[PDB]
């Protein structure tokens, strides 16, 4: 199988920018490559074929180039409607294969996340389980790291992270990080800490609580 590699999963852009998306083939595919555009829950669409030919109806701001193993999709003067996922595909030979996609996102001003931590509710505790949740809301850019500490010690296991897509209105991202333990594991400790490191601050944002107070 020919591997089509799109090294960039995400790219921040602004309306008016010239944007280029790369795709590398593991074997010589000639110019037998096509590019597709896809938006959430919608059909992919053919944009470029034969590496550099524009498919019927696609606007003249999309062009493609390359051959052999290195290919590039270029959007000149990017428009709002261009924010979407893009993926290359080779049809040099079987099996046909696709790149993993590159998502074009919107650029805005950096914003520091709003962090909040919550202990297990007494109710969940009567159930024998204990989830400690931390929200990291409305930040930009998306690059962020959350660290948990139980009694000042890094906790690797049991945490699940979930992220919302970039907000369609305010262009920020939000995330939830939750540490799930049993009531017994949770009750054998005092200090729980949710720490967020983001480019918006040199001192990570630290939020915590002590079980014996609360």
């Amino acid at each position: 199988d020919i591997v089509m590699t799109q090294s960039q999963k995400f790219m921040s852009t602004s309306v008016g920018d010239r944007v280029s998306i790369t795709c590398k083939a593991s074997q010589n595919v000639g110019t037998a490559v096509a590019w597709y555009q896809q938006k959430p829950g919608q059909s992919p669409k053919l944009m470029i074929y034969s590496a550099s030919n524009r498919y019927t109806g696609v606007p003249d701001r999309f062009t493609g180039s390359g051959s052999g193993t290195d290919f590039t999709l270029t959007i000149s003067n990017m428009q709002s409607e261009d924010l979407a996922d893009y993926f290359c595909q080779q049809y040099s030979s079987y099996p046909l294969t696709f790149g993993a996609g590159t998502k074009l996102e919107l650029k805005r001003a950096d914003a520091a996340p709003t962090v909040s931590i919550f202990p297990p509710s007494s109710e969940q505790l009567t159930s024998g389980g204990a989830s400690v949740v931390c929200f990291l809301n409305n930040f930009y850019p998306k690059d962020i790291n959350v660290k948990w500490k139980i009694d000042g010690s890094e906790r690797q296991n049991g945490v699940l992270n979930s992220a919302t897509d970039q907000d369609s209105k305010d262009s920020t991202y939000s995330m939830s990080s939750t540490l799930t333990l049993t009531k017994d594991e949770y009750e054998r400790h005092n200090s729980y800490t949710c720490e967020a490191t983001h480019k918006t601050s040199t001192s990570p944002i630290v939020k915590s609580f002590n079980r014996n107070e609360c």
Binding site: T97, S121, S127, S162
Partner: protein
């Protein structure tokens, strides 16, 4: 215009089978090869194979032999994908697309995809826990409250705050699996002066289990 319309999302039990449809309008599938491609969460598209609706000839890639069965019918302009002996690994969005039979592989027409979710879990109502902030006397502005919805199957659950009156400032996260059952949280941010003087309740609904739960967030734990 030329369009490929696929059937709605399916939540199926492991070991069972499911048959997906892809209907063409504005054009005829006869002179095309209809291909199907799978897309797993956080993963790239993988080709399954094609069918030549004119003769019924099909070609499958080795990973899907005995897993997928493609059929077509040119009079109704519909192609089908049957998936049998389903497992967790078959959970993905499935697309049908079309390209000229004499064409090497350009995919000018694609259906919108069908999400198939496979699990051996039984339908389970969620437990809703209130997320109230501890009594930390440190003086601050805006306050964030939340609700943890845990241990339900299948998706989805819907969550509102104050019956939809509180819409701005809420974040409801994608659900994630924790040993066969789902969990998600929702946060709401309101002015510090308005809570707790004014009630804040999260309304959680889980249509699959015919359950509705309202949790009023009160101070403490």
């Amino acid at each position: 215009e030329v369009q490929l319309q696929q059937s709605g999302a399916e939540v199926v039990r492991s070991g069972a089978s499911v048959k997906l449809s892809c209907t063409a309008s504005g054009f005829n599938i006869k002179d095309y090869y209809i291909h199907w491609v799978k897309q797993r969460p956080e993963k790239g598209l993988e080709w399954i194979g094609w069918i030549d609706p004119e003769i019924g000839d099909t070609e499958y890639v080795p990973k899907f032999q005995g897993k997928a069965t493609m059929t077509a019918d040119t009079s109704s302009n519909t192609a089908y994908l049957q998936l049998s002996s389903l497992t967790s690994e078959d959970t993905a969005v499935y697309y049908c697309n079309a390209g000229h039979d004499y064409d090497r592989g350009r995919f000018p027409y694609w259906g919108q995809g069908t999400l198939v979710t496979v699990s051996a879990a039984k339908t389970t109502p969620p437990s809703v826990y209130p997320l109230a902030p501890g009594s930390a006397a440190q003086t601050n502005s805006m306050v964030t409250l939340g609700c943890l919805v845990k241990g339900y199957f299948p998706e989805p659950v819907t969550v509102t705050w104050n019956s939809g009156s509180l819409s701005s400032g809420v974040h409801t996260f994608p659900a994630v699996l924790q040993s066969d059952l789902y969990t998600l949280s929702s946060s709401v941010t309101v002015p510090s002066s308005t809570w707790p003087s004014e009630t804040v309740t999260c309304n959680v609904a889980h249509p699959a289990s015919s359950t509705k739960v309202d949790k009023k967030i009160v101070p403490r734990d």
